[PDB]
Amino acid sequence: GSDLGKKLLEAARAGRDDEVRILMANGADVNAADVVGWTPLHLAAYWGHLEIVEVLLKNGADVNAYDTLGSTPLHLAAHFGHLEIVEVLLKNGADVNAKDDNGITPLHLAANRGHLEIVEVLLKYGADVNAQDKFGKTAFDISINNGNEDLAEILQ
Amino acid sequence: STEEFGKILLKVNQDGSRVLLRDVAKIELGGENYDIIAEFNGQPASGL
């Protein structure tokens, strides 16, 4: 928990591109985290800040870093419908089949909120469509329960 | 939303199939009551 590391977390969250650029030059800790275990990349992915995700990855940010409940930035990017960030993370070697503590993959989260374009991107980068969570429910089981005709057709 | 009310699980059958609320009801975002219908010079209207 460094001085610059705490400022990078707040900067990445707010989306101040100019401040993040300055903190990367001063050597702010990219692997710094809060109490729940969220990196600047987690926060940047959550609030949908495309530039800061790109800047952090170039400065050796952990793409497959996970919080205290095992959620990676790809989960947050896929769940909250950030198509651009999901592509950038997967290009920089993001684990597409990353399981959290509950066995919920990014495909499950993208399926639940009905983000059709993100499901196609995840499936392209090799998302396990038959991947089950702790309750034994696939991305298809989520689509039929939510009543999504378009999503159910794609997950064939 | 109507979708979230739709996937309310009423019960699970013996075989395993799920009986949702949308399977035993139509779910729309309608009015509290259908007593008042106002018009201003013929066209649809509300007011106070």
Add this chain to the structure above:
Amino acid sequence: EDTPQFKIDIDQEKAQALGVSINDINTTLGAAWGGSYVNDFIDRGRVK
């Protein structure tokens, strides 16, 4: 400012399958972690 909060999703199907009522689940969680004002008692001629 917004802060990290611990979102927990109770699976309805698994609760109904094992035979656990949602009242018992939400009461156990709420009463234990949050606290629950049950009833009054008289401490030296004063309701508390």
